[PDB]
RNA sequence: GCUGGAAGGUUAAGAGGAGCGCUUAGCGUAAGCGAAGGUGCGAAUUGAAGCCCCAGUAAACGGCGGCCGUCGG
């Protein structure tokens, strides 16, 4: 977990998670918006096409 | 389309009657001004229904889609 606060370009203290599922080969750096727990940019898919 | 509302816009004829002309006494050296009256044109303001507008209505009119992916977007 990385508790990314941000005194961002506004001044508001926008807090989120940045979960990195370190899993060797197929890991995934995931900026998880903490208050919503929503992905905002991720790496590996499973659409769930299967 | 109908039913309803319709704050508001716009909308008549009509009441209008600000003013604008012309005639012409009189004033006028001329130039012209010109009162009154007449006569003609007349704006402002007001002017409903209505349509503009907002609802509701499909056993009203009427209408009942496309593109990408592999059923979803």
UniProtKB/Swiss-Prot annotation:
Associates with isolated or stalled 50S ribosomal subunits. Binds to RqcP. Interacts with ribosomal protein uL11. Displaced from the 50S subunit by thiostrepton. In crystallized 50S subunits RqcH is variously associated with A/P-site tRNA, P-site tRNA and RqcP, an E-site tRNA or A- and P-site tRNAs and RqcP2(YlmH). The gene is rqcH. Induction: Up-regulated under secretion stress conditions, possibly in a CssR/CssS-dependent manner. It comes from the Bacteria. The chain holds residues 101 to 150 of 570 of the full protein. Activity of this protein is best tested in a clpP or ssrA deletion mutant; ssrA (tmRNA) encodes the SsrA tag added to nascent proteins in stalled ribosomes by trans-translation, which targets the nascent protein for degradation. This is Rqc2 homolog RqcH. Belongs to the NEMF family. Has 4 domains; N-terminal NFACT-N, central helix-hairpin-helix (HhH), 2 coiled coil domains with a beta-hairpin in the middle (CC-M), and C-terminal NFACT-R. The NFACT-N domain contacts 23S rRNA, the A/P-site tRNA anticodon and recognizes tRNA(Ala), while the M beta hairpin binds protein uL11 near the base of the bL12 stalk. Key component of the ribosome quality control system (RQC), a ribosome-associated complex that mediates the extraction of incompletely synthesized nascent chains from stalled ribosomes and their subsequent degradation. RqcH recruits Ala-charged tRNA, and with RqcP directs the elongation of stalled nascent chains on 50S ribosomal subunits, leading to non-templated C-terminal alanine extensions (Ala tail). The Ala tail promotes nascent chain degradation. RqcH, RqcP and charged tRNA(Ala) are necessary and sufficient to add an Ala tail to a model stalled nascent peptide; does not add Val. Disruption phenotype: Not essential in rich media; synthetic growth defects are seen in double rqcH-ssrA mutants, further exacerbated by translational inhibitors spectinomycin and erythromycin or at elevated temperatures. Decreased accumulation of a stalled reporter protein. Double rqcH-rqcP deletion strains grow normally in rich media. Triple rqcH-clpP-ssrA mutants cannot be generated. No change in sensitivity to erythromycin; double mutSB-rqcH and triple mutSB-rqcH-ssrA deletion strains are hypersensitive to erythromycin. Loss of Ala tailing.
């Amino acid at each position: 977990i990385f508790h990314i606060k941000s005194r961002n370009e506004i001044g508001d203290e926008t807090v989120r998670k940045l979960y990195v599922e370190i899993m060797g080969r197929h890991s995934n750096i995931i900026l998880t918006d903490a208050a919503e727990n929503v992905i905002i940019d991720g790496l590996k898919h499973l659409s769930p096409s299967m």
